[PDB]
Design a protein around this ligand. Structure first.
Ligand SMILES: NC(=O)C1=CN([C@@H]2O[C@H](COP(=O)(O)OP(=O)(O)OC[C@H]3O[C@@H](n4cnc5c(N)ncnc54)[C@H](OP(=O)(O)O)[C@@H]3O)[C@@H](O)[C@H]2O)C=CC1
Ligand SMILES: CCCCCCCCCCC[C@H](O)CC(=O)SCCNC(=O)CCNC(=O)[C@H](O)C(C)(C)COP(=O)(O)O
Ligand SMILES: [Zn+2]
Lengths: 118, 339, 114, 133, 83, 198, 83, 385
């Protein structure tokens, strides 16, 4: 038989994350925009949640960038806004969702460019 | 300067480029450890062959530890070591006057030339280390000579911090191992049967951390700190305690020092690092001075660590298979003497 | 809601298991400090056990608790059946790492991102 | 000199002209010992004894909520306005518009390229300025 | 009690705020004319009941809830604030 | 273009129906890839029953367990997708039975059905955190003895949170929070243009 | 010093690295070595620089030497050609 | 049964194996092998890399069979793309596939003996190995860890002259195997330490997923190369060396026999390798030839995109298994439409074999455990992945 729990699945205790990176890390759920350089829209389809950016100090010996934040390069991809919000809640990371913004329909017709008076 | 970036561990930057001339030492090893952990740039002048300084390589990160060939008699070597350092730490010291280096040299002569150059270089701060209770009149030539130095270096380098540590307690230290190694000797001589020479040990790390903190703090200038310890001890309990953890019989038998200074002279004649020193002997029975002075530990940010706490690690190698598993709890503690 | 029970039907039954594990660890701390020649105090270690057992005191859900002891039991097994040597155990004490201050002024003085 | 950051280097909020509040995200960590503007002032306060109640951004924000609404709701223009009462007070105010013609300071595009600090410090903007001149 | 600022965080199109907004429409101008320096801030919260925040001298802020309050009660509460 | 024989896509397809019919209480979906591979999908409760039927049925003997794995689709409510690939040396065919398990909803263990799984199930617990009831001895296999966190989870940082170095002061190896000297450069590689309807 | 004027400041400590060691640099600098090669006076508006050696060279590109004032320079070799 | 923690004593090696054991005197009561001393993350790292930059990981998974492993990923990526390699490339892969099998068996048989105590067979056959490596180097550039077999065929055609040398060697290697034999197959002592040690039943071998010589040694007839042909291993003719009275000695004999059968397959490949191209002609999957990318725009664009971004495999998942020298090596490669994989569980013939150590070494002496780790050809890279 099933048991009842109203407790938001929080599994922060099982994930195995250091305390500092669960209480000081804000992740943003956003649908990636399109670099204006290209006109393809296949990278503006799935929602992604990305952890907040952290220190990137220069390395003294070779000048390479060096980072102390483990969750930096991690960007998880989630198909829908609801599912991504769920991941933040059970993992205990703070979230600030940004609504998808899709190009509004625009009316175009080759005839217009040859308008008597535009 | 070097803006400090990073999270605080290795592969991070703290901005302390520091020449440390006597790093190979027991204290030294620890000084490079924290400096390297913090991410500081550490230049380690060395004279012993590379084989012996390998232990320092893994400490610190790549391009964070630089080793330079240096000779005390040759002034030029000290010159180039401090060329690009902004912090100079001097730990040059020995217990046995060696054929080609006298207590003056190791304590006063050399440590002067060093700070002297450091100034010419324009190093922001110099930390000079001299033994505790070091009167210009103290019996042991060593202590007196060290006293002579702390004065001089002040004229070569004004406002140069002068930490003055007590005999140090740590693995690979003498204070604790020496007594424990008296096992070979069937009887363990103790002047005045180990009484009236109350001693206050200080963990090596505490000393190291303290020293490091000095490098990164403006409060210490011309300060003559004294890292001391968390509890004093009559030499009797110390000796027995040691033997206690070592689990080896303790047979305190008093030995007239006048004769014992002679025993120190004997081993002193040894060509290979005399084990005891006439100058040592005196030092050992030289009572620890009282604590009224610019405070060291705690004052510089580290709370001293009681001897009993880590003694188990320092004295473990001296036990026998039978007692190896034995732990601190099983053993008893020694007693302090606010006297 | 409407979850399936992993091993404990309710926080009550689950807590029973936590009690057992605590006891287990409590009885074990001394042995480890001796079989690993660790330089720690049994009392000290036993407090650490308490620390951990409470670090996760907030969990209210029965399922999460049950896994927590499964995992906890596994750790004990690695320390009583000794496959975890000192380096592994002492890590719990975070002995070498330098503690970070949590005071705002402290962080301000040191890190760009607190 | 208490160095701060720039909008490429902090999670601050700005608002344009029709009140749409918007959030800058930290693209690069601030340089040198330089720190986020809000913290320098929270820290100066702690060194002064009146210590601002906010210690984490999310808190500084909650603060913005009590003094003003737009600041916390992002991407959201505020619909209603009260023009009618504004006019009543305008009618009370009596002032003379001087005959001097009103002139925008940016008369031609060289006027435009260098205005703010970052702009002024631009080698690219400087190259653009000399190209016009 | 030195009054420096009063913030009326009304919430537009909210049932309770009706009174607050009515106050703004009918008496705001008057209050300002009377106190022509004091800054009375009309701001628009959301999903929050109205609040007449008041900042007194030396950085003390005080709160009076205006949820579901009539136009004159809002007027009376505002008048009580600048005593 | 690879050569494809539809003989298999027909044989395997039929078998799929056969399995489904015989085990309708658990089979949710049964598909054959365009690569001629069958992939019965079963409710997690059908782990024991569906495997056993395949291990011990004259018309479908699937004696050895090729592999037990768990993809992790973070979006999917049931995060893990335990996949069991089996081989039938008698009929020279392989099938894959895949179930879904969330982090704290354990799956049954099949060590009974195939003892090969004794190790792989420990591997899935260590990397992904799924738990297997009735397992003889479930304990970390691949990760370090004191490792905290399940590594192959998509939400775990590659570099991880801890790294090891030898410290002289303490004369013993010691974890420290990871500090990397050249962070993994995260090249973005997806192109903004799709390839086909698929 | 180096190709890009990389010269540690008189106070930088990476100079400690060079203490008792050679800072590796190359006397042969490209910015200069290409200059020596003379402009090729081709007699066709557009010529191609395959890079010398065909497959053992650089991707083939055609240069427009039409501008009478300037000379075409292969984005790859740096070789210059004029009509 | 005093736990001895043997194996961190470098006693059977094959990697680093902490075989915690409980031994009543010289009898083993229970063996609990520990693994992960060589876990390195190969499966997670691949998710962050493109298909072609994850090919070098496969050579490192079990590096005694450097290439055969690469063929398994190749095949897998080719299936997902529904592309097949050109005819010459297929024969090559079977040519170097087999050469690699020999290399593995020379490793397994000779390293087995070194632990047993016979040391001269290793030096005899490591010289032959050496000669083979040179084939790798003159074909790929690297002695081992070549990266020659890529997802769409081979990387570069064989040097002009290799085939002839892969002949001279093959023409003689037999005698070298024959010699080892005169030293071990019938040694009055090899037999003893190997015969009737680690017998595994037929039903139990299938049950514990052994899938390798270990199954074949017990008499089960299964060679994925004959049952499910991959590449052109169908066009060759070889005899699987099945065994009876499966035990360390019998399986050994099987490994010496596949060394023999692989020479039969190599001969053919040299006799019948076709003229042709060594990589698919779809610039979409295979990188364009360097003369073409330096003279044709479509080729540069295809070179730039392929190296910088990737294949862009169509979404799907496949489990493809070959017959790596150790046993069934399979890659389950789940793939989203992206150029970088999503999952790539490597089935290692070896994760299953080690598990069997417990059910094989029961009531056995310390020396028996050493013999059984040898008869499983455990390369800790594949097990730990
Ligand atoms: N109990 C203690 O240790 C106490 C120490 N101190 C002071 O702290 C300092 C460090 O002590 P400790 O580390 O134990 O000393 P050590 O005996 O460990 O030697 C310290 C370092 O000094 C170097 N050194 C010694 N003589 C010369 C020389 N003639 N020329 C060049 N280098 C030399 C050594 O290098 P190398 O070995 O390569 O010659 C060594 O690395 C000492 O100067 C001492 O006065 C003070 C109170 C107590
Ligand atoms: C010296 C070596 C140190 C090693 C210490 C030890 O091995 C590590 C370890 O504690 S292993 C993890 C223990 N963690 C649990 O066992 C879960 C506890 N579960 C709860 O705490 C719940 O929230 C509960 C409702 C019970 C609160 O109730 P309560 O406060 O416990 O009474
Ligand atoms: Zn050119």
């Amino acid at each position: 038989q099933l048991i009842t729990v109203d407790e938001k699945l929080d599994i922060t205790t099982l994930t195995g994350v250091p305390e500092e990176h669960i209480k000081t890390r804000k992740v943003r759920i956003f649908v990636p925009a399109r670099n204006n350089m290209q006109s393809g829209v296949n990278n503006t389809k799935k929602w992604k949640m990305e952890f907040d950016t952290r220190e990137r100090w220069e390395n003294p010996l070779m000048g390479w960038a060096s980072t102390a934040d483990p969750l930096s390069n991690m960007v998880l991809t989630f198909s829908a806004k609801e599912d991504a919000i769920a991941f933040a809640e059970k993992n205990g990371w703070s979230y600030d969702v940004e609504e998808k913004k899709v190009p509004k329909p625009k009316s175009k017709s080759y005839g217009a460019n040859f308008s008597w008076n535009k | 300067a070097v803006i400090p970036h990073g999270k605080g561990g290795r592969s991070s930057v703290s901005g302390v480029v520091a020449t440390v001339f006597g790093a190979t030492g027991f204290l030294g090893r620890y000084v490079v450890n924290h400096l390297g952990r913090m991410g500081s740039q550490v230049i380690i002048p060395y004279r012993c062959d590379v084989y012996d300084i390998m232990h320092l390589r893994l400490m610190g990160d790549l391009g964070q530890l630089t080793f330079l060939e240096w000779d005390a008699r040759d002034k030029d070597s000290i010159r180039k070591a401090v060329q690009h350092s902004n912090v100079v730490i001097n730990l040059i010291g020995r217990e046995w006057e060696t054929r080609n280096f006298d207590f003056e040299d190791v304590f006063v002569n050399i440590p002067r030339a060093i700070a002297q150059a450091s100034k010419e270089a324009g190093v922001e701060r110099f930390i000079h280390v001299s033994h505790l209770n070091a009167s210009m009149k103290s019996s042991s030539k060593s202590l007196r000579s060290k006293a002579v130095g702390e004065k001089e270096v002040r004229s070569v380098f004004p406002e140069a911090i002068i930490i003055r540590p007590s005999d140090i307690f740590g693995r690979e230290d003498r204070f604790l191992n020496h007594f424990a190694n008296y096992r070979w000797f069937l009887a363990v001589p103790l002047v005045s049967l180990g009484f009236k020479t109350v001693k206050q040990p200080v963990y090596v790390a505490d000393v190291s951390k303290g020293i490091v903190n000095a490098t990164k703090d403006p409060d210490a200038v011309g300060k003559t700190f004294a890292f001391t310890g968390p509890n004093r001890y009559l030499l009797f309990h110390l000796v027995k305690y040691i033997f206690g953890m070592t689990h080896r019989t303790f047979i305190p038998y008093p030995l007239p020092l006048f004769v014992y200074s002679w025993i120190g002279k004997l081993f002193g004649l040894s060509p290979f690092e005399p084990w005891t020193t006439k100058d040592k002997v005196e030092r050992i029975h030289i009572s620890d001075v009282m604590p009224t002075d610019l405070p060291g530990l705690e004052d510089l940010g580290v709370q001293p660590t009681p001897l009993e706490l880590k003694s188990i690690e320092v004295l473990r190698r001296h036990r026998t298979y039978r007692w190896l598993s034995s732990e601190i709890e099983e053993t008893k503690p020694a007693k302090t003497v606010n006297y | 809601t409407s979850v399936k029970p992993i091993f404990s039907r309710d926080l009550n039954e689950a807590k029973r298991r936590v009690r057992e594990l605590y006891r287990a660890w409590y009885r074990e701390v001394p042995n480890t400090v001796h079989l690993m020649q660790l330089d720690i105090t049994v009392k000290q270690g036993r407090d650490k056990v308490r620390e951990m057992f409470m670090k996760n005191a907030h969990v209210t859900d029965p399922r999460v608790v049950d896994l927590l002891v499964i995992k906890g039991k596994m750790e004990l097994q690695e320390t009583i059946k000794v496959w975890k040597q000192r380096t592994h155990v002492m890590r719990f004490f975070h002995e070498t790492e330098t503690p970070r201050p949590k005071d705002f002024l402290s962080k301000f003085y040191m890190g760009h991102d607190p | 000199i208490l160095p701060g950051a720039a909008y490429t280097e902090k999670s601050a909020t700005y608002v344009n002209t029709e009140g749409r509040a918007q959030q800058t995200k930290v693209a690069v960590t601030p340089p040198g010992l330089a720190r986020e503007d809000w913290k320098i002032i929270r820290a100066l306060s702690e060194i002064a004894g009146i210590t601002l109640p906010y210690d984490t951004l999310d808190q500084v924000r909650n603060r913005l909520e009590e003094v003003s609404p737009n600041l916390v709701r992002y991407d959201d223009i505020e619909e209603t306005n009260y023009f009618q009462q504004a006019s009543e007070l305008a009618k009370l105010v009596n002032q003379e518009v001087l005959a001097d013609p009103l002139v925008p300071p940016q008369l031609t595009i060289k006027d435009f390229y260098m205005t703010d600090s970052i702009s002024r410090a631009s080698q690219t903007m400087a190259k653009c300025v000399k190209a016009v001149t | 009690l030195g009054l420096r600022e009063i913030r009326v965080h009304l919430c537009q199109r909210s049932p309770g705020s009706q009174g607050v907004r009515d106050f703004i429409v009918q008496r705001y101008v008057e209050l300002k004319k009377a106190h022509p320096n004091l800054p009375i801030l009309i701001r628009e919260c959301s999903e929050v009941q109205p609040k007449l925040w008041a900042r007194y001298a030396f950085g003390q802020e005080k709160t009076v809830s205006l949820n579901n309050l009539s136009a004159d009660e809002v007027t009376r509460a505002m008048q009580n604030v600048l005593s | 273009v690879r050569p494809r024989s539809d003989v298999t896509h027909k044989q395997l397809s039929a078998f799929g129906e056969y399995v489904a019919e015989i085990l309708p209480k658990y089979v949710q979906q049964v598909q054959v890839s365009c690569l001629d591979e069958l992939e019965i999908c079963i409710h997690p409760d059908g782990v024991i029953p569906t495997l056993t039927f395949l291990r011990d049925h004259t018309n479908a003997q699937f004696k050895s367990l090729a592999d037990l794995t768990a993809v992790d689709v973070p979006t999917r409510q049931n995060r893990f997708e335990i996949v069991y690939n089996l081989l039938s040396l008698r009929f020279n065919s392989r099938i894959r039975v895949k179930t879904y398990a969330d982090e704290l909803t354990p799956i049954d263990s099949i060590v009974s059905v195939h003892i090969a799984a004794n190790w792989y199930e420990r591997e899935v617990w260590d990397m992904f955190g799924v738990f297997f009831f009735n397992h003889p001895d479930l304990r970390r296999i691949l990760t370090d003895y004191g490792f905290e966190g399940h590594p192959f989870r998509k939400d775990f940082p590659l570099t991880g949170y801890v790294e090891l170095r030898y410290d002289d002061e303490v004369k013993r190896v010691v974890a420290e929070p990871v500090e990397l000297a050249q962070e993994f450069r995260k090249f973005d590689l997806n192109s903004p243009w799709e390839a086909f309807p698929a | 010093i180096t190709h890009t004027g990389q010269v540690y400041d008189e106070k930088d400590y990476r100079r400690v690295r060079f203490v008792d060691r050679q800072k590796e640099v190359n006397e042969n600098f490209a910015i200069d070595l290409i200059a020596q090669q003379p402009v090729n006076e081709v007699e066709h508006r557009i010529i191609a620089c395959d890079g010398g050696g065909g497959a053992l060279g650089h991707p083939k590109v055609y240069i427009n030497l039409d501008k009478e004032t300037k000379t075409g320079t292969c984005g790859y070799c740096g070789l210059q050609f004029k009509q | 049964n005093m736990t001895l923690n043997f194996g961190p004593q470098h006693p059977a090696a094959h990697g680093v194996l902490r075989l915690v054991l409980e031994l009543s005197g010289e009898m083993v009561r229970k063996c609990d092998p520990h693994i992960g001393l060589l876990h390195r993350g190969t499966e997670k790292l691949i998710e962050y890399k493109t298909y072609l930059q994850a090919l070098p990981y496969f050579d490192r998974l079990d590096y005694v069979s450097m290439m055969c492993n690469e063929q398994a990923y190749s095949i897998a990526v080719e299936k997902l793309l529904n592309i097949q390699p050109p005819p010459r490339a297929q024969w090559i892969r079977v040519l170097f596939g087999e050469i690699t099998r020999i290399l593995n068996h020379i490793m397994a048989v000779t390293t087995h003996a070194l632990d047993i105590g016979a040391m001269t067979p290793f030096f005899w056959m490591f010289e032959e190995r050496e000669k083979m490596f040179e084939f790798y180097e003159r074909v790929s550039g690297a002695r081992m860890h070549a990266a020659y077999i890529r997802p769409g065929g081979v990387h570069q055609d064989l040097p002009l002259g290799l085939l002839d040398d892969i002949y001279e060697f093959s023409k003689n290697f037999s005698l070298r195997i024959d010699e080892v034999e005169e030293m071990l197959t019938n040694n009055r002592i090899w037999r003893n330490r190997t015969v009737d040690i680690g017998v595994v039943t037929a039903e139990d071998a299938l049950n514990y997923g052994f899938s390798g010589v270990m199954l074949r040694g017990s008499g089960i007839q299964w060679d994925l190369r004959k049952t499910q042909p991959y590449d052109v291993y169908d066009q060759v003719e070889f005899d699987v060396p099945i065994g009876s009275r499966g035990d360390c000695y019998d399986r050994y004999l099987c490994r010496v026999e596949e060394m023999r059968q692989s020479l039969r397959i190599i001969e053919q490949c040299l006799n019948k390798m076709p003229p042709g191209e060594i990589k698919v002609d779809d610039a979409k999957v295979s990188p364009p030839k360097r003369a073409e990318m330096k003279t044709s725009m479509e080729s540069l664009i295809h070179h730039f995109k392929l190296y910088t971004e990737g294949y862009q495999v169509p979404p799907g998942a496949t489990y493809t298994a070959i017959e790596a020298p150790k046993g069934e090596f399979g890659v389950y490669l789940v793939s989203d439409g992206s150029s970088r994989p999503y999952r790539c569980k490597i089935k290692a013939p070896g994760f299953a074999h080690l598990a069997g150590l417990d059910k094989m070494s029961k009531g056995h002496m310390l020396a028996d455990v050493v013999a059984i780790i040898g008869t499983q050809d455990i390369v800790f890279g594949e097990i730990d992945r």
